[PDB]
Design a protein around this ligand. Structure first.
Ligand code: FER
Ligand code: ZN
Length: 257
């Protein structure tokens, strides 16, 4: 099965998922001097006030905080998007060391981690249909750097002990994802893909320019999770990031000058 080890990591994924070498794969390096300001891009609308989180799950690759997406409760609109995209889950990618962990890079710079808030286009009715469409998903990507603690992350950090191993889940209601956002919603945007198999090319990426700061203790707690299941040899869940893929025939646009 695919993962992030030497024998099943990103360089192997193309064998089961040939789209791994496709025309709009993610993540990418964001070359800030080549991205072009697009004054026709509108401000992002992040409407998370009615979000209903449900549960947190260690799926053996990351942990996912899942939301009720059966109504327009937490939605992303505006920016490069047409229509309304519902939040279904968020998850992170992180490193074994603070100098790596993010999937997107900025002028080749790697952040300690990267948060992905995954949303699907409501005109396709459900997430499974949306991932089959070129405009089916919108993923809001937010870089994490190590410095001061992020208070709105702490509730997440403190439940991780209860989902240490693959397949474990826990109730995670009443979590407010607004506490994970930076101050500015300035972003870069480009058409890309899921960054895990099946690597489907259905994502409008919206990557915020401003990172959030988390504490060393917070990220250290991420690194105590396990890729393995309970009663298996411990393999720490670290370095669960896919590296930058070729930009190919794509232009990254910036919402800001
Ligand atoms: C394919 O199943 C799923 C994939 C994702 C996200 C994947 C990614 O961001 O790479 C989220 C929910 C899913 O049910
Ligand atoms: Zn991701």
């Amino acid at each position: 099965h695919w993962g992030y080890g030497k024998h099943n990591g990103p360089e192997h994924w193309h064998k089961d998922f040939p789209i791994a070498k496709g025309e709009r794969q993610s993540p990418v390096d964001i070359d800030t001097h080549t991205a072009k300001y697009d004054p026709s891009l509108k401000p992002l609308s992040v409407s998370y006030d009615q979000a209903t989180s449900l549960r947190i799950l260690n799926n053996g690759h990351a942990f996912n905080v899942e939301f009720d997406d059966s109504q327009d409760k937490a939605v992303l609109k505006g920016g490069p998007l047409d229509g309304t995209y519902r939040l279904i889950q968020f998850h992170f990618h992180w490193g074994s060391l603070d100098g790596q962990g993010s999937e997107h890079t900025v002028d080749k710079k790697k952040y300690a981690a990267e948060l992905h808030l995954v949303h699907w286009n409501t005109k396709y009715g459900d997430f499974g249909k949306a991932v089959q469409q070129p405009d089916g998903l919108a993923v809001l990507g937010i870089f994490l750097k190590v410095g001061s603690a992020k208070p709105g992350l702490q509730k997440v950090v403190d439940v991780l002990d209860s989902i240490k191993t693959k397949g474990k889940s826990a109730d995670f209601t009443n979590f407010d994802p607004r506490g994970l956002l930076p101050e500015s919603l300035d972003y870069w945007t480009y058409p890309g893909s899921l960054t895990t198999p099946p690597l489907l090319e259905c994502v409008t990426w919206i990557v915020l320019k401003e990172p959030i700061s988390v504490s060393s203790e917070q990220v250290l707690k991420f690194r105590k999770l396990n890729f393995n299941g309970e009663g298996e040899p411990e393999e720490l869940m670290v370095d669960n990031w896919r590296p930058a893929q070729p930009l190919k025939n794509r232009q990254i646009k910036a919402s800001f000058k």
